[PDB]
Each structure stands twice: as structure tokens, then as C-alpha cells.
Amino acid sequence: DWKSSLILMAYIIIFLTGLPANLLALRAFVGRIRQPQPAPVHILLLSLTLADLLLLLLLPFKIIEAASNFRWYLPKVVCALTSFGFYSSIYCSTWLLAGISIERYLGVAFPVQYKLSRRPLYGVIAALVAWVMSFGHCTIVIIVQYLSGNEITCYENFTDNQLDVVLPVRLELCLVLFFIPMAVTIFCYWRFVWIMLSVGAQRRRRAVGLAVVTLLNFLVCFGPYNVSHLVGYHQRKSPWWRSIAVVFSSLNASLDPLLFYFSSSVVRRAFGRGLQVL
Numbered sequence: 363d364w365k366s367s368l369i370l371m372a373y374i375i376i377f378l379t380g381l382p383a384n385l386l387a388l389r390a391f392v393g394r395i396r397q398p399q400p401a402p403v404h405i406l407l408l409s410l411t412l413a414d415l416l417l418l419l420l421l422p423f424k425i426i427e428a429a430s431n432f433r434w435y436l437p438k439v440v441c442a443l444t445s446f447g448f449y450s451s452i453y454c455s456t457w458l459l460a461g462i463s464i465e466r467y468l469g470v471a472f473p474v475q476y477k478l479s480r481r482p483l484y485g486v487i488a489a490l491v492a493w494v495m496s497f498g499h500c501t502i503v504i505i506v507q508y509l510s511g512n513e514i515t516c517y518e519n520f521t522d523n524q525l526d527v528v529l530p531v532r533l534e535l536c537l538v539l540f541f542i543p544m545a546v547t548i549f550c551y552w553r554f555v556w557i558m559l560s561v562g563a564q565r566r567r568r569a570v571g572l573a574v575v576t577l578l579n580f581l582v583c584f585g586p587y588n589v590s591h592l593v594g595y596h597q598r599k600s601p602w603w604r605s606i607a608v609v610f611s612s613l614n615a616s617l618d619p620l621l622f623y624f625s626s627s628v629v630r631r632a633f634g635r636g637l638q639v640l
């Protein structure tokens with residue numbers, strides 16, 4: 363009861379804290395465009411904002427669930443659409459954050475290439491690759507898993523045979539769409555921070571802060587969910603703390619705003635104006 367209510371209120375907080383800041387971020391980038399940005403970084407970040415918006419706008423469904431002890435029964439189609447809605451955002455975000463890690467390292471360190479390739483169009487493909495990879499692979503999940511008065515919004519008994527097909531797919535996504543980005547993100551930022559270490563204080567604090575946020579996201583926000591998938595092999599059963607792990611997956615949407623503040627000064631100016639009003 364209260365155990366459920368807490369997640370409801372936490373999700374409301376995430377919604378009511380996130381959505382305004384994310385809309386302000388979206389507007390900030392739309393502002394930062396001025397003449398459509400020449401910078402590949404600013405495009406990739408915009409995609410993350412859209413991926414966040416996609417999640418945050420669909421987030422309220424969860425607060426409604428948490429009230430009703432996951433009772434209200436949704437059609438299998440609706441259940442699938444909402445599930446796909448979530449999956450897309452997370453695994454898109456991971457590759458985008460990896461793309462940012464690439465961008466900062468390759469951009470700042472070894473700047474000769476960045477001086478020549480300061481055109482925006484070379485960047486756009488990375489966002490499209492992230493979207494295509496996310497959508498394309500995530501679709502497989504809902505294909506496989508989809509085509510009574512129990513306390514479950516979507517009870518996932520599946521089938522004993524299907525289990526043997528389903529879990530490998532979840533592990534495949536877990537590995538390729540997270541554990542690989544993880545290996546890239548840390549490899550880039552470890553160097554980027556070293557290069558930055560080797561206005562200056564502001565640049566340093568921005569650069570470190572950026573890396574801290576990206577690291578934190580993978581461990582705190584995305585970690586437990588992707589661990590919970592892997593535990594699937596050990597237990598051969600959906601862990602009870604999946605619903606808890608999901609909280610963290612949503613939490614990212616609250617901390618992603620900071621990324622934009624640390625990255626782009628225009629966002630700091632825009633939030634400055636927003637804070638001036640508020």
C-alpha cells in the first residue's frame with residue numbers, strides 16, 4: 363500500500379521535476395539553434411531530450427498503475443505499445459551518451475580532425491544510427507514476447523518454451539545495448555578528463571561534471587535494470603525487484619537535464635532566464 367504509494371509519488375516528482383526542465387531544455391536547444399547549429403554535439407543532445415520527452419510523457423501511466431496495485435487490465439496491443447515506448451528511450455539514450463563520449467574526446471583531444479570536420483552533417487548520422495539501432499533491436503523484443511483477476515497490469519507468464527527464446531534476447535540487448543556502450547563511455551571519458559586535467563576552472567568543472575553524470579547514469583540509473591535481466595539466467599524467473607529497478611531507469615530523466623547544463627552554456631543562459639522568471 364504505502365510501499366506502492368511511495369513509487370507513485372516518486373514518479374510524480376520525476377514527472378513534475380523533469381518535464382518542465384526537459385521542455386525548457388528542448389526550447390533551449392531550439393533557441394541555441396539560432397542559425398541551425400553547426401556543432402555535431404548540439405544535435406546529438408537534442409535527440410536525448412526527445413528520447414527523454416518520449417519517456418516522460420508516457421511516465422504518468424506508471425503513477426496510475428502504482429495507485430491501483432497494477433489492477434487495471436490493458437489490451438495486449440496497448441501493453442506492447444507502452445513497453446516499446448520505454449525500451450526505445452533507454453537503449454537510444456545509452457548509444458547517444460556513448461556518441462557524446464565519442465564527440466567530446468574526438469572533438470577536444472586530437473582537435474586537428476575537429477577543425478576540418480566542424481560541419482554538423484557528419485554528426486547527424488550518429489543520432490540516426492542510435493535511433494535505428496534502438497528501434498530495430500527493441501522491436502524484436504515485442505515481436506517475440508507478444509505474438510483471470512490477478513494483481514498484475516501485464517502478467518508475464520509467457521511459456522516454458524518461450525522462456526528459452528525470450529531470455530537470450532533480453533541478454534542480447536543487455537550486452538549489446540548497454541555493456542558495450544559502457545566499455546566505450548569509460549574509455550573515452552577516462553582520456554577526455556586526463557586531457558582536460560593536463561574560465562579554465564569553469565571548463566574543468568563542466569568537463570568533470572559531464573563525465574561524472576554520464577558515469578553515474580550507467581551505474582545508478584541503467585545498471586540495476588540491466589543486471590536484473592542477467593539475473594534471469596541464474597533464477598529462470600523474473601526478479602521481484604524489477605519494478606524497483608524500473609524506478610532507476612526513469613530517474614535518469616531527472617539527471618539528464620544536468621548534462622545539458624554542463625555541456626552547453628546557452629542552456630545555462632536559458633535556465634538562467636527561466637530561473638529569473640521563476
Ligand SMILES: C[C@]1(C(=O)N(CCCC(=O)O)Cc2cccc(Cl)c2)CCN1C(=O)c1csc2ccccc12
Nearest residue numbers: 420421423424436440441444445448449515516605608
Ligand atoms: C514496467 C514495464 C512493463 O512494461 N510492464 C511490467 C510488467 C508487470 C510487472 O511485473 O510489474 C508492463 C506494463 C507496465 C506499465 C504499463 C503497461 Cl501498458 C504495461 C517493465 C519495463 N516496462 C516498460 O517497458 C514500461 C511500459 S510503460 C512504462 C512507463 C515507465 C517506465 C517503464 C514502462
